Amino acid sequence: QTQPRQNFHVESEAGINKQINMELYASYVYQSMYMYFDRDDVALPSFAKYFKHNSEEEREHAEKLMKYQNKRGGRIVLQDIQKPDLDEWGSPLEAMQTTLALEKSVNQALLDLHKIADKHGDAQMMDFLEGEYLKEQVDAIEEISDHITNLKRVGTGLGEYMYDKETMS
Amino acid sequence: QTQPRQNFHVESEAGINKQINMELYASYVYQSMYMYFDRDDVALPSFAKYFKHNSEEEREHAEKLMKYQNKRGGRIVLQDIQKPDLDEWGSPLEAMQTTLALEKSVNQALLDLHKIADKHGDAQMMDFLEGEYLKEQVDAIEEISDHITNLKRVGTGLGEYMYDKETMS
Amino acid sequence: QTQPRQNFHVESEAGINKQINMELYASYVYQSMYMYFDRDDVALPSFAKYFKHNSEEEREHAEKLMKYQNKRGGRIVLQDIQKPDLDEWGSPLEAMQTTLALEKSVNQALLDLHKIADKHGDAQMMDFLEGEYLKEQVDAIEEISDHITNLKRVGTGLGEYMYDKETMS
Amino acid sequence: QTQPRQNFHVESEAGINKQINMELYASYVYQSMYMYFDRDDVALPSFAKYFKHNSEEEREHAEKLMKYQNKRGGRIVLQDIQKPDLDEWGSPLEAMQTTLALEKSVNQALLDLHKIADKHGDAQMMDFLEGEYLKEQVDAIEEISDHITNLKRVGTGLGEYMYDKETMS
Ligand SMILES: [Fe+2]
Ligand SMILES: [Fe+2]
Ligand SMILES: [Fe+2]
Ligand SMILES: [Fe+2]
Ligand SMILES: [Fe+2]
Ligand SMILES: [Fe+2]
Ligand SMILES: [Fe+2]
Ligand SMILES: [Fe+2]
Ligand SMILES: [Fe+2]
Ligand SMILES: [Fe+3]
Ligand SMILES: [Fe+3]
Ligand SMILES: [Fe+3]
Ligand SMILES: [Fe+3]
Ligand code: NA
Ligand code: NA
Ligand code: NA
Ligand code: NA
Ligand code: NA
Ligand code: NA
Ligand code: NA
Numbered sequence: 058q059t060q061p062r063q064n065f066h067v068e069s070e071a072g073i074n075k076q077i078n079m080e081l082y083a084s085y086v087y088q089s090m091y092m093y094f095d096r097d098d099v100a101l102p103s104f105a106k107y108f109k110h111n112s113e114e115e116r117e118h119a120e121k122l123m124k125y126q127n128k129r130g131g132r133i134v135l136q137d138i139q140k141p142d143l144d145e146w147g148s149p150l151e152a153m154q155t156t157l158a159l160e161k162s163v164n165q166a167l168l169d170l171h172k173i174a175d176k177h178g179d180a181q182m183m184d185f186l187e188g189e190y191l192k193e194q195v196d197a198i199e200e201i202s203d204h205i206t207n208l209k210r211v212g213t214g215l216g217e218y219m220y221d222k223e224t225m226s
Numbered sequence: 227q228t229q230p231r232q233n234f235h236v237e238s239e240a241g242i243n244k245q246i247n248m249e250l251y252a253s254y255v256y257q258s259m260y261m262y263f264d265r266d267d268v269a270l271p272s273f274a275k276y277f278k279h280n281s282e283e284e285r286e287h288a289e290k291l292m293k294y295q296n297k298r299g300g301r302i303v304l305q306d307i308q309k310p311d312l313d314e315w316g317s318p319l320e321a322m323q324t325t326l327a328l329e330k331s332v333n334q335a336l337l338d339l340h341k342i343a344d345k346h347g348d349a350q351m352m353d354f355l356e357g358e359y360l361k362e363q364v365d366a367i368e369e370i371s372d373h374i375t376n377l378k379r380v381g382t383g384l385g386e387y388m389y390d391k392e393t394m395s
Numbered sequence: 396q397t398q399p400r401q402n403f404h405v406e407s408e409a410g411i412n413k414q415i416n417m418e419l420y421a422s423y424v425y426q427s428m429y430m431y432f433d434r435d436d437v438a439l440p441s442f443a444k445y446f447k448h449n450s451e452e453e454r455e456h457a458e459k460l461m462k463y464q465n466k467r468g469g470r471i472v473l474q475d476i477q478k479p480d481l482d483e484w485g486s487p488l489e490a491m492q493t494t495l496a497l498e499k500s501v502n503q504a505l506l507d508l509h510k511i512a513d514k515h516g517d518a519q520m521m522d523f524l525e526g527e528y529l530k531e532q533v534d535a536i537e538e539i540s541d542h543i544t545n546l547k548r549v550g551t552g553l554g555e556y557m558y559d560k561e562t563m564s
Numbered sequence: 565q566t567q568p569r570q571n572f573h574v575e576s577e578a579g580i581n582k583q584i585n586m587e588l589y590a591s592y593v594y595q596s597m598y599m600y601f602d603r604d605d606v607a608l609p610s611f612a613k614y615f616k617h618n619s620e621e622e623r624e625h626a627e628k629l630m631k632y633q634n635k636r637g638g639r640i641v642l643q644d645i646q647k648p649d650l651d652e653w654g655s656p657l658e659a660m661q662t663t664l665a666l667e668k669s670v671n672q673a674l675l676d677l678h679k680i681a682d683k684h685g686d687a688q689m690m691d692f693l694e695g696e697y698l699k700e701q702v703d704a705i706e707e708i709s710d711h712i713t714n715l716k717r718v719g720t721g722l723g724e725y726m727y728d729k730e731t732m733s
Contacts, residue, residue, distance in 0.1 A: 097466075136478055357522065
């Protein structure tokens with residue numbers, strides 16, 4: 058076995074590799090939304106900045122899981138990062154609704170990964186996932202839900218522009 | 227020949243004199259737009275200051291070409307600065323669409339001037355035009371495109387006022 | 396046509412999209428090398444940090460090309476980011492030799508993209524590529540060449556450790 | 565019952581007393597390694613300081629568990645602190661390999677103590693152990709694994725001396 062390995066099951070190791078790829082995938086989706094709102098015919102620069110920041114956060118989530126894999130004596134196995142499902146993301150409201158679905162799918166994957174750790178008595182991995190991932194996902198999901206509600210309230214046109222200026226900046 | 231002159235074709239010299247006049251013309255157009263948005267019956271003061279600043283930048287572009295003409299040993303020959311095509315420029319959206327057309331025509335003139343330098347092997351003039359003019363024009367055309375998109379999004383009335391207050395200020 | 400588009404050929408637009416993917420691919424390679432030297436059984440933390448930094452730099456190279464695509468009126472089309480060719484990278488010397496080959500392939504691809512711009516008279520794109528990409532590539536290639544020479548000089552064992560402590564950070 | 569006692573099983577109380585002694589034992593092992601590397605015929609002062617620091621940390625781990633025992637209404641019952649298995653600890657590599665085994669034994673004991681808390685539904689004790697002990701043990705085991713790898717890489721003689729100077733201090 059690797060030097061650090063203790064109470065670390067191969068199924069947990071494999072599950073961490075799967076979650077690493079999912080975090081990178083999310084980072085790529087947000088990078089695409091970033092550059093979509095940077096288009097001259099969309100031109101909402103604080104939305105663009107918001108997705109730039111979320112793309113960087115997802116990349117950090119991936120690297121923290123990579124570091125954790127190494128810390129436990131697992132071996133990182135990278136997979137292709139699949140391109141996002143769309144090249145264009147619609148209105149600010151539609152992009153936020155897409156983001157809510159993405160963050161809920163990531164959250165479900167983390168909960169499933171936590172279940173693997175629980176199944177194998179990996180108390181430290183469960184605590185790592187809870188404090189470093191599950192808590193952040195609950196915060197992120199509520200924040201996106203707030204965005205969607207406000208975007209529905211302000212409507213299209215001037216409301217989108219003001220939301221870019223007031224909340225997203 | 228003038229003391230500095232080296233690898234500097236009379237056709238490039240003549241082309242710089244033509245471009246100097248075009249920069250001064252663009253400066254005059256923006257000065258007219260500045261004072262149009264300064265009218266009591268238009269009264270959008272940040273739009274006014276935006277065109278004031280662009281008028282000053284265009285004058286700086288013309289003076290930098292005048293200095294370059296002297297530096298290469300060319301001789302500056304000034305022409306009349308033609309008045310702008312209109313006395314009044316319509317809505318903020320229409321004024322910005324007019325500005326996009328102006329900046330694209332200046333850009334095409336600069337590209338044509340670059341072709342003259344290339345035809346005569348004027349490597350230094352090509353680099354001067356690329357770094358000091360071509361790059362700036364691409365940035366300017368994108369920025370104006372962003373303005374047009376945002377002005378379409380916010381609409382007339384309150385939207386034009388808020389655009390003045392948020393983006394243009 | 397998109398609002399900004401001027402003197403911008405579809406072949407150049409397509410080549411930029413291809414180069415974006417290659418920059419992202421190189422970022423992924425360096426991220427893998429980062430986490431490889433982070434392994435408990437490799438444990439060279441300044442090599443790790445070097446590849447972390449180079450991964451971040453490649454991601455910025457990609458995003459600068461994405462921003463340039465938008466500025467010229469092109470449309471970003473993302474593709475899958477392929478996983479690196481290896482899961483582990485051997486010695487510090489072998490990883491640096493792999494890095495040299497990677498940077499030379501990126502450089503040849505950028506030179507080929509420059510040839511597309513030249514073919515279509517895209518003066519501004521050539522200057523953008525020269526100043527923002529070609530210059531950095533010859534600096535990076537020389538720097539990696541220096542690393543390879545020093546790694547050959549110091550040998551394996553204590554030499555790799557000291558190079559980590561003294562040159563890499 | 566003692567005033568604070570709530571949801572605190574006698575088996576968990578006894579397990580904490582056992583772990584207190586194990587932390588004290590680890591502290592004593594590190595204090596011995598500290599003074600071994602302080603010997604005139606070993607004379608690696610940064611290794612010495614490293615084990616001095618680790619001896620203090622283990623003593624703090626013990627005192628934090630004693631404090632927790634009191635907080636829950638348990639009663640501390642101290643046992644003899646057994647002397648370390650050796651009087652001399654060999655090479656830096658051998659000492660680090662011994663410490664990896666020690667930290668893995670401590671980690672297994674903590675995981676077994678966590679199982680006792682789980683068996684009796686002691687949610688607060690499980691969280692205390694996870695956040696204050698299990699996380700630290702995973703970090704410590706990885707750090708020692710790094711040391712072992714580097715010590716194998718640099719070899720004996722000058723490599724040991726340089727490791728003392730560069731990494732340990
Ligand atoms: Fe994430
Ligand atoms: Fe739990
Ligand atoms: Fe917990
Ligand atoms: Fe100009
Ligand atoms: Fe690059
Ligand atoms: Fe040429
Ligand atoms: Fe050139
Ligand atoms: Fe150039
Ligand atoms: Fe301890
Ligand atoms: Fe405001
Ligand atoms: Fe305001
Ligand atoms: Fe040093
Ligand atoms: Fe030193
Ligand atoms: Na923009
Ligand atoms: Na694939
Ligand atoms: Na006024
Ligand atoms: Na005249
Ligand atoms: Na490490
Ligand atoms: Na001494
Ligand atoms: Na005894």
